[PDB]
Design a protein around this ligand. Structure first.
Ligand SMILES: COc1ccc(S(=O)(=O)NC(=O)c2cc3c(Nc4cccc(OC)c4)ccc(Cl)c3n2C)cc1
Ligand SMILES: COc1ccc(S(=O)(=O)NC(=O)c2cc3c(Nc4cccc(OC)c4)ccc(Cl)c3n2C)cc1
Ligand SMILES: COc1ccc(S(=O)(=O)NC(=O)c2cc3c(Nc4cccc(OC)c4)ccc(Cl)c3n2C)cc1
Ligand SMILES: COc1ccc(S(=O)(=O)NC(=O)c2cc3c(Nc4cccc(OC)c4)ccc(Cl)c3n2C)cc1
Lengths: 317, 318, 318, 318
């Protein structure tokens, strides 16, 4: 039988005998994702160029903000686009915190590069009046997380306690069809992904690890290199094909990517798929944040590859 | 005032007082392209998972091949998908030879990477019965070339003598809308693109050129790196942002990886019409005389200051 | 705040502390409606005409039958297309009985007339093995009924004991957006709808009633006439503008042409929950106790003033 | 081979060795129709209902007026929405005059009735500076006409000297696929279509003919009745299934209701190229010489046997 995301998530919910708020949250999120996709693929563009005789990341944030508010399942919302946490109006408060990046990679959307939407969902932990502090949770607290990728097709990857499930958007009917069930990452890969133009500023251990991916001491074949420049695309490739992804800490002692709505959701997808994710000093999911836009270094992928990076990292520490 | 591809190409031909054949060719290609875009974004995929109770490479090739034949404007078709050249049947033959990759980058459609269609159009030059040899012309004989990119959005880039023009596919009405006219590549960029996993196979020229981009002897800012692994996406980003793209030879035969007829030549044509450059290292890509329809070539292309810098290094090691 | 079909129905169901099985049925039926819409608007027709080289009501039935079975919410399925009830196999069996017309008005799909999908849902009470007889229920046993209208736009109209709501399908995102809430029909309208070519076969009650709409007894403005010929379209215009719709018994004996279980009962239900009426002439449509799943019934529905007027003239003629 | 509007019309101009203006005109009109269809089907409607926090006849007229101007092929434009004809600015002037109804039948779009776009194309016969007089030609002077029907699917019907052809829109790729070539209407049909609610004001001529359809004298089968209320829908049905459609004179207007320049005349041309007829009662629609651009005309059209039969009943009563 064909299965959709809303049919999938309804059935886990019922079986957990819950209140329905998480299902309503994810439904609002799907409706947002479909709206973002239709605009990313430029559905309205002829009118902008004058067929009737006469902002993407802003619009994406607007979509995601309003759909989650309208779901009655949230109380605190943290977005890459907003300086402060948005507090949901009293009459619409539900019980979840949502940290998201509504259109990651769109810095370079000029070249029609792959972009995406990243989210992680926390159960509000305190009875207190909702505030920014309700988002300062370690990622090990997540009840759900994942991303939508607007690549050659549009796909939603949702991880939960039951595992990682991939849904393809069928744009002719507006339905997210379940196409890959309970996925698992290869225990060792053959690709490495990072920006080697920063090589002059590399941590000494990053330099050495990469140098071993190109010049293996042991007569194994070198790894191939891929780096789209957009995180949802580089991570999704690592899920599907295996390997390692690096945005590590030398200047930038904390990395460049943001912990709440980039590093933690991807670290959570990775671990539920049988993979790893480190800062180099601890698991990404074990960092306790003190600021909603704070940064974290991130290294994730197949577990044999991450463990190997850590081997070399520790030889330099 | 709004312009669409159909209207732009019809106008260029009208004041060229031509015969309509090329316009009929490009229109056929536009239909195929929009049909490919639909299938790549998966618009009927639910029927495939049983919604009513019960290969993207091959469909893309069928769509191009049938629509081109349909056009009455071609005689020889060369496709990445077919071992030998296709000869159009007598009753549908026109005067153009077409070389194309119907879905470049489809190797990695599994991870949903950008994919694209690349084409190059030649006037048949010989007066012989049409044959594979009609498609063995040097890239400098092209009358038209370009690519459809299925990325975050779907865009057609079309190069001709008039220059380079960029049309965005509006899916709501299914029309290609002119949005960047007579585009030109920046003289020098700040991004370099190549698969650095072949580092132990690069020749001394590539090795030194790369090192100049990470460690500038003039102490200017190092270049950033990007490599999608899908040629149409990397090349289009080179057009739009500047910089350089490379696929040099390696121990996968010293002949390079990318195909001359339907990958390197159409992109090199796009780049030179945009004020850029494209070299094998030994010669310009557009001057290679082919001997085989699927032969490979190495390519270094992009902004002109960046390819020239590459070429001054290559000369120092020559 | 924007609302949708999924969110509206999932909240009514949580409020009722139900099992969510009715929601599984409705979500699955909404999927089927969206694919029927796509096919009715001809979203792949170019492939049928050969662009790559190489039934609508049949496919609508296949869509509804397979989506309903996999909801795990039905046990007996009655369709205009099928001679007998279909009995869902044990492993997929749920408590609801559905009767539906998967693409009504399909006879004139050649002229691009509006068509639609009609449905009505009963709870199965007993403990017995499911059987065709479980669908032989009066329409007052309905827990939900409605229709999808494929007109200038596609719209879903859904009636439950909480009232009638109307959801517009947004093709760009594939979502049913609530646009009219808790809808109520005009007390009295100014339009009447029937196939008047059967004038020579009308009951005297119908002929007087019609002549009272053209030569009214009180110098009212005569009514206008509209008859599209596709039931879903005629009934929806009646819901939105007011007036009366009639399919009486011509030669067809005091029986008429339309079908009681999957045409007459769902529209009678939508009319009554929206404050209208529906009568056979002799009784309320929703009171008829049926003995055959494909039995027919006379039907007269619309604004309550207009139906009371006809029923007044009807009684004078008995 | 699969054929599209743009390829059909382009090949028609080639054989005539034309200037490209009429092809430009129809290309721009098709683009306007695709955007109308997307709008009519409510493609971005959720944004209206607050999905991101923060008209239809106006938009259609805007789309048609702007695309026609941008086509470089027109000089005077008449639309139902504008009291005065639009004069195209000198820079953008071409040789054609277009009369159109941008969204016919839009009044009752709220009940999701079929709607459509009607057009008629004349060549400017005069010599002086272009003026509203350039639209006051008889329908006999028409170079081409037709309509778009926004029904269950969207179809453009196209009429010129080579006959009538029907192109279906495939919304997945936005191409108009030719699906019925050189169509011709049946010699005699079995359907009559008119607003019978105004029977109290009928000409004695149509009250006899209409009774001949419900009580045939030879005791053959009586006709069926259909009236949508939307001209483009009722007329398309007549073209496809045969029969007769009526909006006659009486005293609601001695000159009927529909407008001659952009409703009756395009539909009279389509019919006559299809082997049908179109009369005012007094004369053939296409022979009236207008004196006002917005003037009205009675219309009786359809299958030729049917219309001659109406004419005789009308010849009798005068
Ligand atoms: C791990 O994945 C998830 C995903 C979502 C959730 S949830 O919080 O949003 N709950 C739902 O979705 C949910 C609950 C539910 C439901 N409850 C129920 C049943 C029996 C007794 C009872 O007394 C407490 C309650 C009945 C019918 C239905 Cl259709 C239901 N649905 C959809 C939780 C975990
Ligand atoms: C540089 O870009 C291009 C693009 C396309 C072509 S072409 O070969 O396909 N020709 C066309 O497209 C074309 C030609 C044409 C046309 N010709 C014409 C005019 C006057 C005299 C004459 O007697 C020989 C012929 C008239 C009207 C129209 Cl609407 C036309 N169209 C569309 C060539 C170059
Ligand atoms: C009038 O409209 C309708 C429409 C549909 C239905 S239903 O049969 O299809 N079931 C649902 O809808 C449903 C139920 C449900 C649910 N149950 C629940 C709640 C509290 C106590 C309890 O202890 C037995 C059970 C929890 C969470 C959620 Cl999200 C739920 N949903 C969606 C009923 C009426
Ligand atoms: C009733 O059917 C129609 C439909 C449209 C038109 S038209 O006015 O718009 N012309 C066109 O469409 C047209 C013309 C044309 C063309 N002309 C030509 C050929 C030879 C000598 C010459 O010396 C002046 C001119 C060449 C190539 C092409 Cl591809 C052409 N096209 C498309 C007219 C009638």
């Amino acid at each position: 039988d064909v299965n959709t995301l809303t049919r999938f998530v309804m059935e886990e919910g019922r079986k957990a005998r819950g209140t329905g708020e998480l299902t309503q949250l994810l439904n609002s999120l799907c409706t947002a994702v479909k709206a973002i996709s239709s605009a990313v693929r430029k559905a309205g563009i002829a009118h902008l160029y004058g067929i009737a005789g006469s902002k993407l990341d802003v619009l994406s944030n607007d979509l995601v903000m309003n759909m989650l508010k309208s779901s009655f399942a949230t109380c605190v919302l943290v977005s890459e686009e907003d300086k402060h946490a948005i507090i949901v109006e009293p009459e619409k408060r539900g019980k979840y915190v949502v940290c998201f990046d509504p259109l990651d990679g769109s810095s370079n959307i000029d070249c029609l590069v792959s972009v995406g939407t990243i989210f992680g969902i926390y159960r509000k932990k305190s009875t207190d009046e909702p505030s920014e502090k309700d988002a300062l949770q370690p990622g090990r607290n997540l009840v759900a997380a994942g991303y939508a990728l607007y690549g050659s097709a549009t796909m939603l990857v949702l991880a939960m306690d039951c595992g990682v499930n991939c849904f393809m958007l069928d744009p002719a009917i507006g339905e997210f069809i379940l196409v890959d069930k309970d996925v698992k990452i290869k225990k060792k890969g053959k690709i490495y992904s990072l920006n080697e133009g920063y090589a002059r500023d590399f941590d000494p251990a990053v330099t050495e690890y990469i140098q071993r991916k190109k010049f293996p001491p042991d007569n194994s074949a070198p790894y191939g290199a891929r780096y789209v420049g957009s995180m949802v695309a580089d991570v999704h490739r690592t899920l599907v094909y295996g390997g390692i992804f690096l945005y590590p800490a030398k200047k930038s002692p904390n990395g460049k990517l943001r912990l709440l709505y980039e590093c933690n959701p991807m670290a959570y997808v990775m671990e539920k798929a049988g993979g790893m994710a480190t800062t180099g000093k601890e698991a990404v999911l074990d960092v306790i944040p003190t600021d909603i836009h704070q940064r974290a270094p991130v290294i994730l992928g197949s577990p044999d590859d991450v463990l190997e990076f850590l081997k070399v990292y520790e030889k330099h520490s």
